[PDB]
């Protein structure tokens, strides 16, 4: 079978980003030894090791949706993957408010329309507790 590839964006500190960029544009396999990525079983924490120097990482959710688009002639572009996550290196904490491009900053707060009426999972847990019970008493309340 075929499994859709999973692309994400890696953001590094600027000096380490310059060393990683120089090693990528060089093209040797020396970069392979220099750059490693260890993702912790939390799922939202990691180490990126640049030149064997550990950096602390967080996998965050991006507010917009990006899409990688490949081309052969630079006139027709084929969508290859959807990017929604970034492993910035240096829950509410795992949500990034800004977008990658310069015009998109504070997009989640300002350029996103918010419509409102985790919570569903809590309601399911409450229903399960009511089922495991015997007698349930309920009242919409006031200030108390």
């Amino acid at each position: 079978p075929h499994e859709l590839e999973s692309q994400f964006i890696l953001r590094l500190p600027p000096e380490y980003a310059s060393t990683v960029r120089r090693a990528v544009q060089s093209g040797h396999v020396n970069l392979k030894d220099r750059l490693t990525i260890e993702l912790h079983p939390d799922g939202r924490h990691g180490i990126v090791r640049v030149d064997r120097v550990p950096l602390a990482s967080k996998l965050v959710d991006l507010p917009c949706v990006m899409e990688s688009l490949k081309t052969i002639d630079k006139k027709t572009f084929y969508k290859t993957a959807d990017i929604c996550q970034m492993l910035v290196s240096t829950e509410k904490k795992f949500i990034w408010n800004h977008g990658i491009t310069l015009p998109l900053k504070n997009v989640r707060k300002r350029r996103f329309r918010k419509t409102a009426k985790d919570v569903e999972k809590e309601v399911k847990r409450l229903l399960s507790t009511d089922a495991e019970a015997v007698s349930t008493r309920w009242e919409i309340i006031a200030e108390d």
Binding site: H2, E3, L10, G27, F77, K79, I100, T101, R111, S135
Partner: protein, 457 residues
């Protein structure tokens, strides 16, 4: 001396996808999307592998792929020059759609949930619309990507200024203004697969403005919706019959039940009733063999049954159905069937749109709202001109804000719910737990089930 052809009563109103996309192959075009997969629609999380090299916990080296990129590009140029030197079609396999080769650009979206969105494997074009200056003009400012076209009639809602080039994504699904920005100096692109990590740099990232929809998303329980569900199931059944190696072609029912698990089996039987029959005993037992008089349709007929853009419109409809369902009339107006119907009707000239409203995906004055207003002490030129000028103003504000490289500084009853629970502890006990829910969101979802279960008797 005028038109005099009643054209609105007689006539009321190129993209080649990859061979995995036009054949609707199941990684790229899913048969069924559950609720947690509809909430993560076009935002796929980073899954943990169970088997593979990355499934073992520990540090993992990323691998540079620049010999791979230039080897694949040199190989594709050899293929193109061996085939006569013209333009070729290369995306014939799923392994052609990897990010490991070719010139990748990134495309960011301004809206959170667009009315239409491309699946993986589908093609789009970049068109550079350039309105010439009055009289003499030097020529279109040249651009790295796309082809240039001179537009006297603006494709979008606003109109282009003289001497203004605007790039845009153009395909069958939408048409949307894009703006080229340079990448940040810190961000790279990591392509992870089961075997390892791979790293590319990126240099070009476009920002995609508000989409102008060219395909109408169907509504829920619509006739077009049910027709697409039936045709998609039929195409999947035909492609399972084509994949069968048995000389009387035969399939199993629980393959289709694995693909479409929300379907009642009465509908799947209905699709298999014509073109197949069930063998209970003897050879081919518990199989749905193909009828001997039935000619299985060819590949081009199966491609003519369902289009990939219809699948994208259906996925937009069911994702919006989930988001509306989770959030308990303003929201219903912002649903893509309403907004796509409004925009396509405005493009034929049926009706006008209030460009400031609640269907505005920004939530501020930037961007349009595609909801229908009637085209009616002026009742004619005043309304039309007012709508037109508001359209040019919004188009021009969005272009400026999006192309800005300026840095932006980081910035009813009032009643809670209380529940008493009675349980029995180990040995013998009867403790009672009183729990108070102060979250009005938890409240609404909780109560709605009881009121439903109270009527469910």
């Amino acid at each position: 001396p005028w038109n005099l052809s009643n054209d609105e009563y007689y006539y009321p109103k190129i993209i080649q996808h990859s061979i995995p996309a036009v054949e609707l192959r199941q990684p790229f075009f899913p048969t069924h999307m559950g609720p947690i997969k509809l909430r993560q629609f076009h935002r796929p999380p980073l899954k943990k592998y169970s088997f593979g090299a990355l499934s073992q916990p520990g540090p993992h080296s990323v691998q540079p792929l620049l010999k791979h990129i230039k080897k694949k590009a040199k190989m594709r140029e050899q293929e193109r020059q061996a085939s006569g030197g013209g333009e070729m079609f290369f995306m014939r396999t799923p392994q052609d759609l990897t990010g490991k080769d070719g010139d990748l650009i990134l495309a960011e979206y301004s809206e959170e949930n667009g009315p239409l969105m491309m699946q993986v494997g589908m093609a789009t074009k970049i068109k550079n619309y350039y309105k010439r200056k009055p009289g003499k003009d030097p020529g279109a400012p040249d651009c790295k990507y796309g082809e240039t076209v001179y537009c006297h009639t603006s494709p979008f809602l606003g109109s282009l200024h003289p001497g203004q080039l605007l790039q845009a994504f153009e395909n069958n699904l939408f048409r949307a203004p894009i703006y080229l920005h340079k990448m940040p100096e810190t961000d790279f692109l990591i392509i992870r697969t089961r075997q390892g990590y791979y790293i590319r740099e990126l240099v070009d990232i476009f920002v995609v403005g508000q989409q102008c929809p060219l395909f109408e998303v169907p509504g829920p329980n619509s006739k077009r919706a049910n027709t697409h569900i039936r045709d998609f199931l039929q195409v999947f059944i035909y492609r399972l019959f084509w994949k069968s190696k048995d000389r009387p072609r035969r399939i199993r029912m629980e393959d289709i039940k694995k693909a479409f698990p929300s379907h009642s089996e009465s509908s799947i039987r209905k699709r298999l009733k014509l073109c197949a029959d069930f063998k209970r005993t003897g050879m081919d037992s518990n199989w749905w063999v193909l009828k001997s008089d039935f000619r299985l349709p060819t590949e081009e007929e199966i491609r003519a049954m369902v289009s990939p853009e219809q699948c994208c419109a259906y996925y937009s409809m069911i994702a919006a159905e989930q988001r509306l369902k989770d959030a308990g009339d303003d929201e219903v107006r912002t649903a893509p069937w309403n907004t796509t119907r409004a925009f396509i009707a405005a493009m034929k000239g049926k009706c006008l749109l209030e460009v400031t409203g609640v269907a505005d995906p920004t939530g501020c004055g930037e961007g349009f709202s595609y909801v229908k207003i009637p085209n009616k002490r002026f009742s004619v030129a005043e309304h039309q001109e007012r709508y037109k000028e508001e359209c040019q103003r919004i188009f021009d504000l969005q272009n400026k804000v999006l192309s800005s490289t300026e840095v932006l500084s980081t910035d009813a009853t009032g009643r809670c719910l209380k529940i008493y629970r009675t349980f029995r502890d180990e040995e013998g006990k009867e403790y009672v737990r009183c729990e108070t829910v102060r979250k009005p969101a938890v409240i609404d979802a909780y109560v709605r089930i009881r009121t439903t279960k109270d009527e469910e008797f």
